[PDB]
Amino acid sequence: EAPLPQLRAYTVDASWLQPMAPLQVADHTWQIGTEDLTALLVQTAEGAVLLDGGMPQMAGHLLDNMKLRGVAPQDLRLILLSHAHADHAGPVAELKRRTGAHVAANAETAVLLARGGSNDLHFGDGITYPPASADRIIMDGEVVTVGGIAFTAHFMPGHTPGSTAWTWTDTRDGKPVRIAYADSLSAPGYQLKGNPRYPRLIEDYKRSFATVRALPCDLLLTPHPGASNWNYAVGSKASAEALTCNAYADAAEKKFDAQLARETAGT
Amino acid sequence: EAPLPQLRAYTVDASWLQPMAPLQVADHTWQIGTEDLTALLVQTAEGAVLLDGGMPQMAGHLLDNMKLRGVAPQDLRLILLSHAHADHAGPVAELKRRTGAHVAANAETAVLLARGGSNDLHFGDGITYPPASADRIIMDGEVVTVGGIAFTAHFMPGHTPGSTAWTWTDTRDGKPVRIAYADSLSAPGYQLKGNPRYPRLIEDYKRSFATVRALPCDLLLTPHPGASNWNYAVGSKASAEALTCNAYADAAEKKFDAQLARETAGT
Amino acid sequence: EAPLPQLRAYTVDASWLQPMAPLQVADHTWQIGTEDLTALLVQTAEGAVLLDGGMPQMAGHLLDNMKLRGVAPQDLRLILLSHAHADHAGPVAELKRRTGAHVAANAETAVLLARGGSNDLHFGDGITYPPASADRIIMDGEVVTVGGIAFTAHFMPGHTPGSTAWTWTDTRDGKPVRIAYADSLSAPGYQLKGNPRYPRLIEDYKRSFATVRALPCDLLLTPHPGASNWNYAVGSKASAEALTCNAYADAAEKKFDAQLARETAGT
Amino acid sequence: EAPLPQLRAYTVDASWLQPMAPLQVADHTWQIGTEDLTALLVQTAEGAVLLDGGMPQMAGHLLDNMKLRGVAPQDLRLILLSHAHADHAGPVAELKRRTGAHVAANAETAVLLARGGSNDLHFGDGITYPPASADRIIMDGEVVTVGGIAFTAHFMPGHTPGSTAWTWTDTRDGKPVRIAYADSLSAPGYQLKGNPRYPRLIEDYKRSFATVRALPCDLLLTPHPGASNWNYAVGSKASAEALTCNAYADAAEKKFDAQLARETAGT
Numbered sequence A, B, C, D: 001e002a003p004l005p006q007l008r009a010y011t012v013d014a015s016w017l018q019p020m021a022p023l024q025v026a027d028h029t030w031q032i033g034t035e036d037l038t039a040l041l042v043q044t045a046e047g048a049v050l051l052d053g054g055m056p057q058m059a060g061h062l063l064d065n066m067k068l069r070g071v072a073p074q075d076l077r078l079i080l081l082s083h084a085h086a087d088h089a090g091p092v093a094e095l096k097r098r099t100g101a102h103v104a105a106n107a108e109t110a111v112l113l114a115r116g117g118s119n120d121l122h123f124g125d126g127i128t129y130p131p132a133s134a135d136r137i138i139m140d141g142e143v144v145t146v147g148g149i150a151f152t153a154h155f156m157p158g159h160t161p162g163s164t165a166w167t168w169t170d171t172r173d174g175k176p177v178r179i180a181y182a183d184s185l186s187a188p189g190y191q192l193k194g195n196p197r198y199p200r201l202i203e204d205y206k207r208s209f210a211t212v213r214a215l216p217c218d219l220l221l222t223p224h225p226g227a228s229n230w231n232y233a234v235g236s237k238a239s240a241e242a243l244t245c246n247a248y249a250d251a252a253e254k255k256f257d258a259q260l261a262r263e264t265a266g267t
């Protein structure tokens, strides 16, 4: 008779695991992840900040790219996160061990991070990663500063309860560039209506679309670059087709509304 | 020359520490705390629920009152909290050790509970208690059920980020009684405007007044009974002067608005 | 060019995942795991105790077997562990959520359990499971009692730093049966000499052999039943070939000594 | 009638809270705590290490002394601990928040640190401090290295289960100085025999005396300086009367043996 099933690993498209060399986004800001997963390094006079790490197996690659940018492991001061899913916060535990960086995150992200993504509201235990602890709990609108560069958190719950957009002002050609690293707005296979683990899910998504629309936003980036129409693999032309924050929110809301109607129609 | 100061203990008015016998609120619901701190025991066919415990030194008294109600330590199934301050969640750690109960709380309450109230947004380390872990993380509107009795969480952030109202329907004289255990709405010594640790504090308070106004509410109780005009010490007449949810929110908002104007005026 | 590798799942022999009906070990003690992974249910007048859960996907099966024994989910009071590896503590998180049980474990087991087995001294992140929190920290020789049945912890570090043997006295045919649930003594692929993550590994193993030899031991069981020569699949004859504690320790030490000499010889 | 008692604060002798200027112990090692509580700063080419912090209210003073030594808050890389009691690990949480340092500690110290000293085996909740998380779990004999300086952990359980001695080799006048920072060996008000929370307490103390005797030890320091006969307040003559490791262990064992006999005699 049938044995219980084997555990199944969280697998992803090859391009999500495809290393790339550092790609400059603005004067201090570099994409140092893979072709299809964002990991942003911001370099200051007093150390580096990392926003997202991608998948768990990307830890070594990120350190290699940091070294290419002149950042030794001990020079990484701070890790910030969009949300605590395996494909964005995957390597946080290993990075903390190997760099001495601290993690700052809101309470929702902190508790999910500390479970390693287990008991996810929608995924259960299917998509997990090594747990990590948040060292600083931040609140909506709170400013985290490293080397004079100020990062502001904007809560946009939905994709996870702790979903966060991070904004900061870099420069390029002597002009300020307000960067918005806006979190995911997808609801992949989620039950949207009457979800007992997330009763106000629809209300949170709706508010989060409005939050993204209003972000200070000269240049938008997203945890999955295709969501904001970036193409990291083409190098200097990677940002050419990037969406505004307005267009990113609009596309996400239209997709959400269609999914909601399909759920009412049983599919 | 001066040595560093001694540590100072969190002290409270004597009435907050004054034991009282169990006082029935509805058919299954009892106040079993002290004269001036609420701790509600709800007794079901499949075990008891405790909402708040008061101060840390109240653990033994609560167990005594539980025994008077026929509830042995192992019969306590679940602990719920208004918010994770020393005067309401004080004895949670000891109760968990001595009863085997689980704690359910939202992510904000969970992270503050696990710090024992340390690094409080407003109090720093001045008001602390033994840390405890939440066993179940709950979301806004989520229903927690014990022995058929359904408790619904309503987030009302402000007094703490994790502040929660809990509602449930008990009975009395054959009629349903919608009980609302609404959290504190005070801002004791808080900086309200431009607080770097709580940038959206005013917006959260304002939304929380509206949340309390709309709660299902035949009978209101509050962590400090005087806030809803209860007088536990008079026994059967204790509820006579109790406020509605509408009046509790209105009084709290007027107090908040006055405090905000005083803050603008430097006091 | 090559993408980074996909994550690989922890897979096991089919027999480790092969459900079995409850098999009585003594008057109150039942094997309720799979054919090749031990999970012991001890049933008292005041609730049940579970020693080990096996693999993460065994949670539902264990609850089914508990129901067959008359134990509802809420009747499980306590979970004890041999050691916090995925194949023995795998389902602890889910069991806690679904039963309200508490976990008691020593500090080493607690910290590994709370990492979900990640950053293992020998396995790294290769063999992980959903993290869980210990509710009671126990010390060497400490007695944990449920329904009058006393379980004593005997630390036997080596296989993991937190490896524990649990002993208790059951009955059979009116006579006492001193049961010893002794932890694993294997060192699967471990570096034994000069291991920077475990400098006293050899000394701990050597002491643990002596600890096992001296356990009160009328009947020995082990997390992998083949280690003590049990054959769960044959039912009433399952214990016939079981080893004494003396013989289990002797076999383990001889295997360890041979492995140590092979390590010196480069293999 | 009597209300429940007020919470009582952990108070200490004034000299434990008496700031002192940095006192050099060897070429890289400085006492930067108070007159009667040790806090050792070791300064390397790649950042500073702190061994113990003393009481919770010493955080600001330690940062002041670090600045006097040329160490900015961000230059503190690592915190090590003798044991996780309020008078030695008191300010760890605040130091981590303000410096970005990581904490390394064994599993026993980690779990007590994360409880803020609550549920102490002997003190209960009477002596607590803000909880902090360990970032690196270390094993007996494990080496932690910063800026080329190697610190070795030597477990000496007794005063707490996680009690640790730390050793390292500094220099003075061109000659190596093997420093031993040996933990406390007192048992203040402890029940020694048949303690249900610590059944092997006597055996652990006895082994720990032998451990201290065998430490590499040209210069001994202790968390309470009087325990090793230091007098921090006299400056350059502070080390003159310091005990050897042999004499520290001998004095502690004689005190322990006398206390044990007194316990048998009921006092």
Ligand SMILES: C[C@@H](O)[C@@H](C(=O)O)[C@H]1C[C@H](SCCNC=N)C(C(=O)O)=N1
Binding pocket: A012, A085, A087, A127, A159, A184, A185, A186, A188, A223, A224, A225, A226, A227
């Ligand atoms: C665990 C999931 O959240 C993860 C997965 O499928 O593995 C993906 C699914 C959506 S959308 C990704 C669409 N791909 C490229 N744009 C998502 C996100 O929006 O962050 N991550």
Ligand SMILES: C[C@@H](O)[C@@H](C(=O)O)[C@H]1C[C@H](SCCNC=N)C(C(=O)O)=N1
Binding pocket: B012, B085, B087, B127, B159, B184, B185, B186, B188, B223, B224, B225, B226, B227
């Ligand atoms: C730590 C503080 O939050 C605590 C204290 O002062 O000790 C009190 C202050 C306010 S209002 C209490 C007013 N007293 C009676 N109604 C408050 C609450 O609203 O929960 N608790």
Ligand SMILES: C[C@@H](O)[C@@H](C(=O)O)[C@H]1C[C@H](SCCNC=N)C(C(=O)O)=N1
Binding pocket: C012, C085, C087, C127, C159, C184, C185, C186, C188, C223, C224, C225, C226, C227
């Ligand atoms: C993660 C490992 O610890 C696990 C595995 O290989 O998957 C096994 C290896 C050894 S020995 C098991 C031998 N099999 C049957 N007797 C072991 C144990 O002794 O607990 N578990």
Ligand SMILES: C[C@@H](O)[C@@H](C(=O)O)[C@H]1C[C@H](SCCNC=N)C(C(=O)O)=N1
Binding pocket: D012, D085, D087, D127, D159, D184, D185, D186, D188, D223, D224, D225, D226, D227
């Ligand atoms: C909480 C206790 O551990 C603490 C206290 O009494 O406040 C002291 C008592 C002993 S011995 C201290 C003796 N004083 C000077 N040598 C001790 C130690 O050995 O670490 N700390």
Ligand SMILES: [Zn+2]
Binding pocket: A083, A085, A159, A184
């Ligand atoms: Zn995601």
Ligand SMILES: [Zn+2]
Binding pocket: A085, A087, A088, A184, A223, A224
């Ligand atoms: Zn994603």
Ligand SMILES: [Zn+2]
Binding pocket: B083, B085, B159, B184
């Ligand atoms: Zn409060």
Ligand SMILES: [Zn+2]
Binding pocket: B085, B087, B088, B184, B223, B224
């Ligand atoms: Zn209060």
Ligand SMILES: [Zn+2]
Binding pocket: C083, C085, C159, C184
């Ligand atoms: Zn194992």
Ligand SMILES: [Zn+2]
Binding pocket: C085, C087, C088, C184, C223, C224
């Ligand atoms: Zn195993």
Ligand SMILES: [Zn+2]
Binding pocket: D083, D085, D159, D184
């Ligand atoms: Zn101490």
Ligand SMILES: [Zn+2]
Binding pocket: D085, D087, D088, D184, D223, D224
């Ligand atoms: Zn001390």
